[PDB]
Amino acid sequence: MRMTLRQLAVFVAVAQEGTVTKASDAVRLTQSAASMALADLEDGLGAPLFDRLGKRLQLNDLGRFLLPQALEILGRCEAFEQAAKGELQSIDLRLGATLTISDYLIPDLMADFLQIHPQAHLQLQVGNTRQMIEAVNQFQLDLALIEGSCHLPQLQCIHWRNDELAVCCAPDHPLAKLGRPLTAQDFLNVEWILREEGSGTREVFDNAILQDVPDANIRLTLGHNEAILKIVAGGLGMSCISRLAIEPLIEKGQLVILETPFWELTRPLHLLVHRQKYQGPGLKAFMNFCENRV
Amino acid sequence: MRMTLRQLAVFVAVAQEGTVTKASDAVRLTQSAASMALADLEDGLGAPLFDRLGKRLQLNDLGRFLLPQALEILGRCEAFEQAAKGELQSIDLRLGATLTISDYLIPDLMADFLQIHPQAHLQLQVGNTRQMIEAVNQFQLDLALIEGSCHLPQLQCIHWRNDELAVCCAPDHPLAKLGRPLTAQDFLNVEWILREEGSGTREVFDNAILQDVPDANIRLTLGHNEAILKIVAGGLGMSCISRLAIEPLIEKGQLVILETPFWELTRPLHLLVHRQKYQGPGLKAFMNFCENRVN
Amino acid sequence: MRMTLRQLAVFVAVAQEGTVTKASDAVRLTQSAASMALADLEDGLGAPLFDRLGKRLQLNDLGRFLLPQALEILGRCEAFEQAAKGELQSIDLRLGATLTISDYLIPDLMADFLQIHPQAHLQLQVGNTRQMIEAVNQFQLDLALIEGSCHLPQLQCIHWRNDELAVCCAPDHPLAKLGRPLTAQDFLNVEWILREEGSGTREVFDNAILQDVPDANIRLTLGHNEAILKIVAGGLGMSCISRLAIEPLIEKGQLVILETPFWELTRPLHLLVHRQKYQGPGLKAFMNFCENRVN
Amino acid sequence: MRMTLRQLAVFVAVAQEGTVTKASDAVRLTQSAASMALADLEDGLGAPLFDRLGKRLQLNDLGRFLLPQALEILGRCEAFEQAAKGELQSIDLRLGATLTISDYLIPDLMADFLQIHPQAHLQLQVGNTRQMIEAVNQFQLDLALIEGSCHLPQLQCIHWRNDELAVCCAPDHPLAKLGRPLTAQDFLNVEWILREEGSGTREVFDNAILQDVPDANIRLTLGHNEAILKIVAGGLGMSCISRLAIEPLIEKGQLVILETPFWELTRPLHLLVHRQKYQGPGLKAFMNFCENR
Ligand SMILES: [Mg+2]
Ligand SMILES: [Mg+2]
Ligand SMILES: [Mg+2]
Ligand SMILES: [Mg+2]
Ligand code: NA
Ligand code: NA
Ligand code: NA
To answer: Is Metal-binding one of the keywords UniProt gives this record (chains B, C) (predicted)?
Structure first.
């Protein structure tokens, strides 16, 4: 046996960060100490682990195959030291979250997780669903909390909770004061202010509300929940937004919700992990925590 | 067939004037060129558009049937030229904004802009300064409101306003309880909860504070302002973040600002456009609107 | 009026081809005549119509606003030329089509249309639904026949016809021998041979089947309908694919369809056009042929 | 981690041997080197892993609890090393192909490959030669089968096989019903239905046929081999297309290939890879499989 746990950690860090420089800071080694370690691993194994893309290092065919094995070896070693000293030692997680989850759930969730584990190391990256999927796919994230569809076969979609979107408008919109239940045909000429194409929130509108209003008027598309709601509340215009974002403004008399039972505005929120990623003590403790928010 | 606008103009002028000579004067042409134009049109259509009775030209049934088509074509060519010369475009902007700007300035700014121009088409993308520079450099955005450096010669970085950052901590942080004024040395072993490498907020910290705390304990790196403040108020460490984000928490007694006059925590905010990209009237209206915003 | 139909046609072709050289071939002008046509148009209008990305030309704010007007001016000229002669001068269509449509419907469609209008100029682009939507979005296509979902606001989708997909397998598959009708549970542990993630066929499996076998083994993902069907028939494994592609093999005895009434596998096919594109005589003639070809 | 695989190996050996001496030989290590390692391990855990009897070393309770964990870690490290040294990874390939290749060669090529390697993971992207070039240049693909021309030096181009394309027409076309050897001039006035520019099949009309036909009415341009042939059979014109595509129509009487010996019309099909991309056992398997057909 030539390889060392330090070398495996460098191999993992380079796969997570993309360069020896970024990887060296993540394992707390000088840059040439890290490059010596990676070179020793590759020379000992008799093959390179990364294709050299001029600048970035990207896992090659062998590196991809070996990466999950390295993560399991490192995770068991962490479990080893834990199982001796008798409790959760080091937590080091790279997390991702989509826009609505990060605005209205992540701050409380991470703060509460750090009250219980004051020593936990957590990185947070925010993006849309497909940016999260690709990050988990590249082993760049340990876990992502997503609000969009979940359909990649090598990734695992663990249902976390359901999120209710709603059609909202200004309190003085004519449809809010209508003396009869609403119909889909009442929204034919509404001006919609929606989330960007490709986001999970926009998915719901396109797959639930666009069917009935195929010529829906959509001039404003914003990748920001608050900007949408301030414009909707600033006069006419409607949006289909998570109740997580609307309800804080319903308290301030800025918005109302229209009853639209003819449209299914559910969506599932998911925890996204790689099916091959060994779940060491760190990750697993965080997943259960997220689940135990029953 | 290969007809021309000139031929349509002569066709219409003859329809309105009755003679080639007066038609040629209307459309600013020689009698020979106008006569030639009408003949080319009729030969292209393969049938006459006028009955010929001496020098006078009278529309025949075909002429009367095609005249409104010609008038519409000529009318829309004039609208085309006027719309271009007068730059009569509607507002149709693809905008970009960095995190702190998007969170605390974009909502009211865009809401107030849409009050004046409620029919404007706008798209907004949110990301990091580096992500915005690339978008603007690829001609994917008309304008970006960034909170970071911009050292690019092909891009034009216009100064918008200033953003004041501050060091904040939970009200009972040991450093918050000191009597004397603070010094940079007091911060050597602070646990820093910071924005990611590549953000402009992290640029302020790296530029000002790191010179005095070389091995600063970067306890956490989070790409979310509120997550940072929640964790700092919860009792873990400090952050260097915009006073726009801190203030509502100061008002609620969840964060305090530590005086650090030995550190310059002022940052410029910039309007970022591509020097080679045409600027329409909508972009110029939004840029002037941003410039005219209070501070 | 200094601008000409020739210049408008160049302006359109550049928007559709992306370079002057490719535009000059589309409008059958030399490179020089084409570049001079665009430059003079821009000079007269007092502003450029395209942003320059090197040799790439992409419409700028003013160009995007004026392009629909140019298309309408040229279409009305096509209509003028035909209304006087009685017959369709130019049919000149840039068409798009998704794979299943391109594999089993377009071939006999264009061949039959070209027998009715033997003078038409047709160009056929092929791709998945995301590309046809983008291609049409840029005005690079007059019309696309798509098999996926239609969600961009600036485009319009006319319901063309329906297409029924079906789970299929080799005749000797264990699930094809059972006597008791099948359940969603029988399909646990099946090896799936599916189309690529960004296709309308994979869209049906992802939203109509995947929610019942979430751990569904998806070992092979192929952007080719025939490759899938040959692999499925050559051993075990199944796919969910259009009956247009399966049924030649079902009647050959190389595949069978498993009845799956617990899954909705019907999906619409659409005609896709830009809402801002003027529908001239040629285009409107083709759209009518496709409508009058269902039943 | 302050613990090392070396420490684990020594912790296992003493458990299997019982004395530091024999445990040192079976790990191929000096006595001092091995005793130093066990000292560090018990240090960085907080407690000892053995009871001492002069120097008989039998597992105390802690050692018995952690030993099976040490054996599993060491076993996975050994498996990790044999997997790497022997390149025992599975097949996980991202493949590309041009249109004629995808339509007429890929279906039975991939199906037969999967009869040999049934658990292989394959992905297929279909697109013209220049998309595949860039895809392989961007590491978006492990291999591409291209019917076009190779240009780049940091790409490796490997001759796969030759492809003969021919000029095809409708059987009742006047030129076909003629009883005379055709000439390059008998084509001067005829309708040509070609594939898109910048494509493999296009190269052969623009490099071989466009040297002899002056008018050369490029009546159309379609990026679909079949649509071209359905049209050509409807009575409209001719095309210079791969014979792999034509012969299916010939068995049905819809197309006839014309005699045209004054035009070469041979074009090579190539395997395309990147010179700096590590080739695992899966890629070499598929590449050799292609070459042996
Ligand atoms: Mg935010
Ligand atoms: Mg100051
Ligand atoms: Mg001038
Ligand atoms: Mg049905
Ligand atoms: Na990497
Ligand atoms: Na700035
Ligand atoms: Na110009």
So the answer is: yes
Residues written for chain B: 295
Helix C61-85 with B61-85: angle, nearest 10 deg: 170
| Resolution, expressed in angstroms to one decimal | 2.3
Q: Concatenated DSSP letters for D118-134?
A: TT-EEEEEE--HHHHHH
C-alpha A54 – ligand 5 centre gap (Å)? 13
The 3 state secondary structure assigned to chain C is: CCCCHHHHHHHHHHHHHCCHHHHHHHCCCCHHHHHHHHHHHHHHHCCCCEEECCCCEEECHHHHHHHHHHHHHHHHHHHHHHHHHCCCCCCEEEEEEEHHHHHHCHHHHHHHHHHHCCCCEEEEEEECHHHHHHHHHCCCCCEEEECCCCCCCCEEEEEEEEEEEEEEECCCCHHHHCCCCCCHHHHCCCEEEECCCCCHHHHHHHHHCCCCCCCCEEEEEECCHHHHHHHHHCCCCEEEEEHHHHHHHHCCCCCEECCCCCCCCEEEEEEEEECCCCCCHHHHHHHHHHHCCCC
Residue type, D85: K
Q: Does D181 touch chain C (CB under 8 A)?
A: no
Question: What experiment produced this structure?
Answer: X-ray
Evaluate whether C144 touches C132 at the Cβ level (below 8 Å): yes
Which residues in chain D have Cβ-Cβ distances shorter than 8 Å to A80?
3, 66, 69-70, 73
Q: Is A1 on the interface with D (CB under 8 A)?
A: yes
Q: Which two tokens stand for residue C65?
A: 């606003």
Please provide the CATH number assigned to the domain covering B97-161+272-291: 3.40.190.10
Query: Is D164 part of any known ligand binding site?
Result: yes
89-128 in chain B: CB under 8 A from chain C? 89-90, 92
* Residue D39 backbone phi and psi in degrees, to 5: -65, -45
Q: Which amino acid is at B166?
A: A
**How many Å apart are CA D99 and CA D106, to the nearest integer?**
10
Which numbered ligand comes closest to the C-alpha of C46?
3
Which of chain C's residues have a Cβ under 8 Å away from the Cβ of B65?
Answer: 83
Contact C265, C208 (CB under 8 A): yes
Residue D264 labelled as part of a binding site = yes
Question: Which residues of chain B are in CATH 1.10.10.10 domains?
Answer: 5-85
Report the CATH architecture of D161-267: 3-Layer(aba) Sandwich (3.40)
Q: Is the minimum CB–CB distance between A220 and chain C shorter than 8 Å?
A: no
| Beta carbons within 10 angstroms of residue C194's beta carbon | 26
Domain D5-85: assigned CATH number? 1.10.10.10
Identify which ligand lies nearest to the alpha carbon of B101: 1
Residues annotated within a binding site of A for Mg(2+)? 43, 103, 164, 264
Instruction: Give the Å distance between the CA of A8 and the centre of ligand 5.
Output: 14
CATH numeric code, C94-155+273-291? 3.40.190.10
Q: Which residues of chain D neighbour A47 with C-beta distances below 8 Å?
A: 84, 87, 278
> Shortest CA distance to A289 belongs to which of A90, A114, A85?
A114
Which positions ≥6 away from B73 have C-beta within 8 Å? B5, B8, C73, C76, C77, C80
- Which two tokens mark B187? 């911060």
What's the start-to-end Cα distance of chain A, in Å?
A: 46
Look at residues A28, A30, A31, A34 and name the one whose alpha carbon lies nearest to residue A8: A34
* Residues of chain A found within 8 Å of residue D3, distances taken between Cβ atoms: 5, 77, 80-81
Q: Which fold has domain C162-268?
A: D-Maltodextrin-Binding Protein; domain 2 (3.40.190)
Using CB atoms, which residue from C103, C114, C230 is nearest to D234? C114
Architecture of domain B162-267: 3-Layer(aba) Sandwich (3.40)
C103 is in an annotated binding site: yes
Rounded to the nearest angstrom, the minimum Cα separation between B254 and chain A is 14
- Apex CA D192: angle with CA D186 and CA D194, to 5°? 140
- D103 belongs to an annotated ligand binding site: yes
